[PDB]
Amino acid sequence: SGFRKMAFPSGKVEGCMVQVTCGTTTLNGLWLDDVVYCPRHVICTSEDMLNPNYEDLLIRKSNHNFLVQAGNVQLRVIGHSMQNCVLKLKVDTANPKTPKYKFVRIQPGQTFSVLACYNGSPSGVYQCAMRPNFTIKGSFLNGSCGSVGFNIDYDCVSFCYMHHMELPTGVHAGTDLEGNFYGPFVDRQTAQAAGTDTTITVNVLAWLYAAVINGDRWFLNRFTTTLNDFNLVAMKYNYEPLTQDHVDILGPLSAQTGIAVLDMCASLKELLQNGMNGRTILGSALLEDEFTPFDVVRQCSGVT
Amino acid sequence: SGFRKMAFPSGKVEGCMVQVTCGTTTLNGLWLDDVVYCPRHVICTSEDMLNPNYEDLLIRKSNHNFLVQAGNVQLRVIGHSMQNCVLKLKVDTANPKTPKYKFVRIQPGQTFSVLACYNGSPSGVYQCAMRPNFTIKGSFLNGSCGSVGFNIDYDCVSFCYMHHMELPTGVHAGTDLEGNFYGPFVDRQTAQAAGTDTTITVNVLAWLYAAVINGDRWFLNRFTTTLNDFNLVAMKYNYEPLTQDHVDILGPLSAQTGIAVLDMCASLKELLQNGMNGRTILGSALLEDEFTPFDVVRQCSGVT
Ligand SMILES: Nc1cncc2c1CCCN2C(=O)Cc1cccc(Cl)c1
Ligand SMILES: Nc1cncc2c1CCCN2C(=O)Cc1cccc(Cl)c1
């Protein structure tokens, strides 16, 4: 019983964190096998960030200009290349702590854990979601670049995010592990505005199912709705449209509780229209959208 | 920028998790040096839990009746003793992954990270607080007993909690690593009710300072108050009384923001009296009390 914003155990990722310095810029790198992955803006000075030509700036850098430190020991850089917005530094030593891993590009609405790091050292772990506007609401300070986002399936770490940038609004942008930014963001010190941060409806529904499983049931109403009727309401409240794909994914939660997906949509519709009236659900006074239906099943079943 | 409920990186604790089985009961153990610590109710059947005499039940158990498995390998139990509500199983092998560690008994209001485990395997990490009624609001399923709570200072893990029990209300109770329960709880299948779960005022104030640091400032008012006036309001809203010790601990946050502690108390007083009016602070529609002033300083400074 109880429901928490839970992150994956970070050990497997902690074993991969390294410090990468180029010139006077220091950030985090991810050491997997004999490659260290880091944001390409490690080669930039603050002045370079205004309008960087990364290919040009990289010509002035050789293998010995990239200082990679794993713990208190120096790794020897024997090759370097740029893949989109990430640098791949080939080192002469495979990371002995390399876990089984994959690189995945996630969809908006998907959740992951972040191991926030500074100087190659882990400071904390938290759970977040890729927003529908392709930003993340993280907790990152200067030096946090190169910290990564990931999910774990038994013994396999799927790396999905690498932190690159803070927007002028204090929200965060980054890339997958192939260096492609999520969303339209560019690694440049130029004002970039994020789009509408809509609520991830399927995740709110998953969290309403988690609340019923854990005993918070006051919000269950006597109504039902249709996908089209619900979506008219969802549109009005800047919620993402619900599709039959989302209904399908909520099926195991509907089966466990005996509450039809469309009945739960009608409960959500009434909560949107009437508010919480000073009440709480799972210790929250607002509708939580950073738990996927998979996260709810995982937490409520105890997958390790 | 950004503010998250952040847990400590769990790696150091993951390396200590083991599975302990006695008869047909299986739970988690914490392997540090050559000792495995686990809840004493590992020796109980479900029938025994109704009215257990642990000293009597333990007479029927020998070293070979405790099966300790670390990963997929079996540890040899060469001694066993009961210390309060925990069993200490001496094994013939020191844990090679034992981090630098201390056992601490925390005060109510203090926060810690929990590495929730099942069958000796970590499932997730989350941050919580020792409530003023000595319960924790965790996320624990059957098999989670023996999962631990901890804090980390650079390379030293301070273990503060070991999970033992779920109360009939779905809140959690457990012990320090010396086996002494927090609060008046007993390891028995008997209905035990928790006292008033008051709000940890000093933590709410720390989180209001975190909000100002991160740009959420709408709640700052033109008023000030006194400790006695504030505490009259705090009493009325089931908030813990604020003392000069709490004011002293908020000093670094007051210094960073230039907002006197008593001015922040007056802002909190108005929020209690007027509510949030549909607004949010740091993404929350309620006042958060699971961040200590130390946690806010740590997250806002990037301690690793
Ligand atoms: N607090 C914080 C969090 N996450 C990143 C950053 C900060 C503060 C300063 C460093 N930083 C950046 O965003 C630096 C940067 C500038 C322009 C483009 C890119 Cl790719 C990066
Ligand atoms: N869901 C859950 C979470 N945390 C613990 C437990 C559960 C469900 C069943 C196991 N369990 C217990 O509390 C078993 C127990 C009974 C009586 C006294 C003590 Cl010390 C322990």
Give, in order, the Cα–Cα distances in Å from B56 to each of A276, B67, B95, B174: 52, 20, 30, 22
Which ligand sits nearest to residue B2's alpha carbon? 1
Phi-psi region at B258: left, alpha or beta (left = phi > 0; alpha = psi -120 to 50): left
Packed helices A244-257 and A293-301: angle between N→C axes, nearest 10 degrees: 20
Q: Which of B45, B35, B50 is nearest to B83 (CA)?
A: B35
Only one residue has tokens 């990564």, namely A148
Backbone angles phi, psi at A11, to 5 degrees: -45, -50
Q: How buried is residue A217: exposed, middle or buried, by Cβ count under 10 Å (0-12/13-18/19+)?
A: middle
Contact by Cβ (8 Å): B247, B36: no
Which ligand sits nearest to residue B167's alpha carbon? 2
Q: How buried is residue A30: exposed, middle or buried, by Cβ count under 10 Å (0-12/13-18/19+)?
A: buried
CA A144 – ligand 1 centroid, Å: 8
Instruction: Choose the catalytic residue: A145, A163, A164, A265.
Output: A145
DSSP lists the bridge partners of residue B175 as B162, B181
Within 10 A of B122 (CB to CB), how many other CB atoms are there? Answer: 23
- According to DSSP, the β-strands at A73-75 and A66-70 are antiparallel
The CB of B40 under 6 Å from ligand 2? The reply is: no
Instruction: Choose the catalytic residue: B41, B80, B163, B246.
Output: B41
Q: Could you tell me where the beta strands, DSSP code E, fall in B85-188?
A: 86-91, 100-103, 111-118, 121-129, 148-153, 156-166, 172-175
Only one residue has tokens 């959740």, namely A111
Chain center to CA of A295: 13
Token pair of A137 as six digits: 């609401």
- Residue B83 carries which DSSP code? E
A145: annotated active-site residue: yes
Which ligand sits nearest to residue B28's alpha carbon? 2
Which atom, in ligand 2's list, is nearest to the CA of B172? 4
Please compute, for residue B81, the number of CA atoms within 13 A of its CA located in the half-sphere on the CB side.
Answer: 6
Only one residue has tokens 């995010």, namely A161
Helix, strand, coil abundance in chain B, percent, nearest 5: 25, 30, 45
Q: Which residue of A has its CA nearest to B210?
A: A139
DSSP lists the bridge partners of residue B73 as B70
CB contact under 8 A, B2 and A144: no
Supply the DSSP string of A153-199, one letter for each residue.
ETTEEEEEEEEEEE-TTS-EEEE-TTSPBSTT--SSSS--------B
Q: Which of A35, A33, A36, A41 is nearest to A18 (CA)?
A: A36
> How many whole angstroms separate alpha carbon A167 and alpha carbon A145?
13
DSSP lists the bridge partners of residue A66 as A22
Sign for the CA dihedral angle at A223, A224, A228, A234 comes to positive
Supply the DSSP string of A250-301, one letter for each residue.
HHHHHHHHT--HHHHHHHHHHHHHH--TT--BTTBSS------HHHHHHHHH
The CB of B164 under 6 Å from ligand 2? The reply is: yes
> How many whole angstroms separate alpha carbon A120 and alpha carbon A30?
9
Chain center to CA of B291: 12
Only one residue has tokens 């020792």, namely B130
> How many whole angstroms separate alpha carbon A152 and alpha carbon B188?
36
Instruction: Please list every residue in chain A whose beta carbon sits closer than 8 Å to the beta carbon of residue B27.
Output: none
> How many whole angstroms separate alpha carbon B76 and alpha carbon A281?
46
Give, in order, the Cα–Cα distances in Å from A34 to each of A66, A68, A235, A261, B292: 15, 12, 48, 47, 40
Backbone angles phi, psi at A26, to 5 degrees: -125, 130
Q: What is the dihedral of CA B113, B118, B124, B130, to 10 degrees?
A: -20
Q: How far is A56 from chain B (nearest CA, A)?
A: 31
Backbone angles phi, psi at B214, to 5 degrees: -90, 10
- Residue B285 carries which DSSP code? S
Longest dimension (CA), chain A: 68
Contacts of B59 (CB under 8 A, 6+ apart): none
> How many whole angstroms separate alpha carbon A242 and alpha carbon A196?
17
- The 3-state DSSP class for residue B203 equals helix
Backbone angles phi, psi at B218, to 5 degrees: -55, -30
Instruction: Please list every residue in chain B whose beta carbon sits closer than 8 Å to the beta carbon of residue A10.
Output: 9-11, 125
Which H or E run contains A110? none
Contact by Cβ (8 Å): B117, B27: no
Only one residue has tokens 């010790």, namely B245
> How many whole angstroms separate alpha carbon A246 and alpha carbon A234?
14
DSSP lists the bridge partners of residue A17 as A30
> How many whole angstroms separate alpha carbon A126 and alpha carbon A8?
9
> How many whole angstroms separate alpha carbon B3 and alpha carbon B117?
26
Which atom, in ligand 1's list, is nearest to the CA of A141? 1
Q: Which residue of B has its CA nearest to A8?
A: B124
The CB of A25 under 6 Å from ligand 1? The reply is: no
B145: annotated active-site residue: yes
Q: How far is B23 from chain A (nearest CA, A)?
A: 22
Contacts of A160 (CB under 8 A, 6+ apart): A103, A104, A105, A106, A110, A112, A130, A149, A150, A151, A176, A177
CB contact under 8 A, B144 and A302: yes
Backbone angles phi, psi at B294, to 5 degrees: -65, -45
> How many whole angstroms separate alpha carbon B204 and alpha carbon B193?
26
Q: How far is B60 from chain A (nearest CA, A)?
A: 32
Only one residue has tokens 């479900």, namely B46
- Residue A7 carries which DSSP code? B
Q: Using CA positions, which residue lies closest to atom 16 of ligand 1?
A: A189
DSSP lists the bridge partners of residue A90 as A35, A79
CA angle, residues A9, B21, B95, in degrees to nearest 5 = 55
> How many whole angstroms separate alpha carbon B16 and alpha carbon A152?
19
Q: Using CA positions, which residue lies closest to atom 8 of ligand 1?
A: A142
The CB of A40 under 6 Å from ligand 1? The reply is: no
Packed helices B293-301 and B201-213: angle between N→C axes, nearest 10 degrees: 20
Token pair of B98 as six digits: 């034992």
- Residue A72 carries which DSSP code? T
Annotated resolution, angstroms: 1.6
> How many whole angstroms separate alpha carbon A187 and alpha carbon A54?
10
Contacts of B301 (CB under 8 A, 6+ apart): A141
> How many whole angstroms separate alpha carbon A207 and alpha carbon A2?
12
Token pair of A159 as six digits: 């790396």
Contact by Cβ (8 Å): A158, A152: yes
Within 10 A of B24 (CB to CB), how many other CB atoms are there? Answer: 7
Enumerate domains of chain A plus CATH numbers. 1-14+100-197 (2.40.10.10), 15-99 (2.40.10.10), 198-301 (1.10.1840.10)
Within 10 A of A61 (CB to CB), how many other CB atoms are there? Answer: 15
> How many whole angstroms separate alpha carbon B184 and alpha carbon B173?
9
Core vs surface per residue A74-108: b (16+ CB within 10 A) or e = ebebeebeeeebbbbbebeeebebbbebeebebeb
Q: Which of A191, A171, A114 is nearest to B215 (CA)?
A: A171
Within 10 A of B153 (CB to CB), how many other CB atoms are there? Answer: 12
Q: What is the dihedral of CA B22, B24, B27, B32, to 10 degrees?
A: 20
Contact by Cβ (8 Å): B152, A31: no
- Residue B302 carries which DSSP code? T
